[PDB]
Structure 1
Amino acid sequence: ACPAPPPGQPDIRAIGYYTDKAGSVIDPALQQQNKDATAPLDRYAADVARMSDDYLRNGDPAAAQCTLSWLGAWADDGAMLGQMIRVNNDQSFYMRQWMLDAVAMAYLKVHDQANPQQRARIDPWLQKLARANLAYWDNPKRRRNNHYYWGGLGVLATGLATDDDALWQAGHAAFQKGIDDIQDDGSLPLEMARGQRALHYHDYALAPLVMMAELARLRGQDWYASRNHAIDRLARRVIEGSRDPAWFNQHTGAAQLPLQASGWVEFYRLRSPDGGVFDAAHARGPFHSPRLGGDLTLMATHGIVRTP
């Protein structure tokens, strides 16, 4: 009753799809190539997201055992521990970050049903993907925009699930840089340079900062307070933007593409409702995002974990 996982490929070969300097103008052809080259990775991500969602939703341990079996299978296969093949950019590396986020979060959701044999296979594999993602960012030439925040989520989840203190601190460092980047107007200077997609990249930067704050909460820490509730500016800026892009239209001189806020709202409204400004976005739910851990509605309402 646990279906067969797809084989785990050690190598990734994703493809960058932006043509302009502002990373805002898509080549439909290049977008399709990336979509097709990453479909297997995205299927696995959605699947372990979904089965771990199933486990949170009814507590059936079969769904948790099937999640753990899939994670174990890709760990034994050494999935994603091979070559990040550069094609026109660092997209293969970005996928290893995004995939660690999905698998680490899935693991964490079903971690209370893992047996010693399962921890021993999965933990080393998460730790290895975590330390590889981290070493990319030791190079000061690498621009620490939203990619560093998405990297941080997976490293933070791995540190929590595998009880590795170094990864926990290193994940905290990726969260802290994102918060430190929030200006008084709630903008992120590197995301302000994405022209047409500036509002999208503000929302996109925020989602993993929220989820990292939520992982801290599991451990009994409150990171939401950092730098006098700086996150609230980015949150209000983003939710303002989804309603009316005018501020973004002026500040970038580009007409923002259409945007609805992503599933961070599910968590954020509970921690800082700000007189209901995030309720309209909530009403559009439920939100499914495998790279943020899957059903953000379910996890916001009922917890990322069923037991501490």
Structure 2
Amino acid sequence: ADLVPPPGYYAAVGERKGAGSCPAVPPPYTGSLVFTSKYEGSDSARATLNVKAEKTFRSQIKDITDMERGATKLVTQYMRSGRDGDLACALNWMSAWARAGALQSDDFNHTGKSMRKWALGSLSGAYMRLKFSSSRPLAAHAEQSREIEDWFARLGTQVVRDWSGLPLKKINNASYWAAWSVMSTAVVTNRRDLFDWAVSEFKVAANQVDEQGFLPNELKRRQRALAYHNYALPPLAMIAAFAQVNGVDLRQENHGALQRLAERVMKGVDDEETFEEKTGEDQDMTDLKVDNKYAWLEPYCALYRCEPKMLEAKKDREPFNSFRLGGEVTRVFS
């Protein structure tokens, strides 16, 4: 059977009254993907922010950032209000990068291949709505659609190469996000090999969740441990939600590991104690205060019967927008 997204991705294009213009496409990024890490100089915990290095990093990736944020924004605006100019603009941006063969460099380091997988997830995740909307907005744009989908397929194959062949100690949230990008790409391109890789990566993650709901590789990030556990949830929950409607039920993998992880995270958010006791360090709660970092609640509560605690957590923070997940996460799960 052809691969499909969750049913919410088939929603008609909206007609909400809102009209921004079409900005120039960010220059397609065809350079080397060898970037400075924001954690440059850290010990093995890789949890010490280097402000100067981060500034350098953000500058290096600026065109990629602008592409990710801008193109998802255009798709979101189109799905909300249905102005053809926004569709045309979004497709012009994505097809420009596709034709240029952006982000395809074989010259990369960890930070660089992470930019490749992140941008792939953002763009394909947004494009998913265009592709499967009952309005069929791509019907009039066959050439561009083909160009864009072929580019996604090239990048997806490369992302599998980028994160394959690793031992567990080197498989962390970075791989989970890569698996989301590859799952998203798999459904856009109807590529079962990509689908299968993302599923296998989820299963690795599920088996990394220990008997208490902790991930050893995320615990290693010391004061950022809780933040990184929360950061693991969105791609894992998205992968499971996508796999489910394609006939692969991952909810019970390793004794319901995804639920065990989610419940442990939410315990830590209520009270940091157990993560501190587990890591021996006070947790940086900064990221746990950011509403959109709980976007994982949308696919999660589509998968599991959420108890009132989870439901209220979702209700209080809705709607969720997360460009790395394709934009409007609440809308595609309602």
Q: TM-score, normalised by structure 1?
A: 0.89
Paired-residue identity, %: 29
Residue pair 1:181, 1:189 contacting (<8 A) in 2 also: yes
Q: Distance in 1 between matches of 2:162 and 2:108?
A: 14
Q: Structure 1 119/145 Cα, relative in aligned 2: closer, same or farther at 3 Å?
A: same
Letter of the 2:320 counterpart: F
Residue pair 1:55, 1:110 contacting (<8 A) in 2 also: no
- Consecutive aligned runs of 4 or more in structure 1 exceeding 6 Å deviation: none
Q: Distance in 1 between matches of 2:87 and 2:195?
A: 24
1:97-125 deviations in Å (ceiling 9; x for gaps): 11111111122121142233123211221
Q: Structure 1 44/218 Cα, relative in aligned 2: closer, same or farther at 3 Å?
A: farther
Residue pair 2:223, 2:281 contacting (<8 A) in 1 also: yes
Partner of 1:216: 243
Which has the higher mean CA deviation after the structures are superposed, 71-80 or 61-70? 61-70
Q: Distance in 2 between matches of 1:219 and 1:72?
A: 28
Tell me, yes or no, if structure 1 residue 140 matches structure 2 residue 140. no
Q: Distance in 1 between matches of 2:72 and 2:245?
A: 19
Partner of 2:111: 91
Matches within 5 A, 1:156-167: 156-167=183-194
Which has the higher mean CA deviation after the structures are superposed, 137-146 or 12-21? 137-146
Partner of 1:15: 36
Matches within 5 A, 1:1-308: 2-11=22-31, 12-18=33-39, 19-86=42-109, 90-112=110-132, 113-114=137-138, 115-140=141-166, 143-219=170-246, 221-258=248-285, 259-260=288-289, 261-278=293-310, 279-280=312-313, 282-301=315-334
Residue pair 1:96, 1:129 contacting (<8 A) in 2 also: yes
Residue pair 1:45, 1:290 contacting (<8 A) in 2 also: yes
Note the residue ranges of structure 2 that are not aligned, 5 or more in a row: 1-20
1:181-208 deviations in Å (ceiling 9; x for gaps): 1122111111111110010111111110
Letter of the 1:196 counterpart: Q
3-state SS, counterpart of residue 277 of structure 1: helix
Note the residue ranges of structure 1 that are not aligned, 5 or more in a row: 302-308
Residue pair 2:126, 2:325 contacting (<8 A) in 1 also: no
Q: TM-score, normalised by structure 2?
A: 0.82
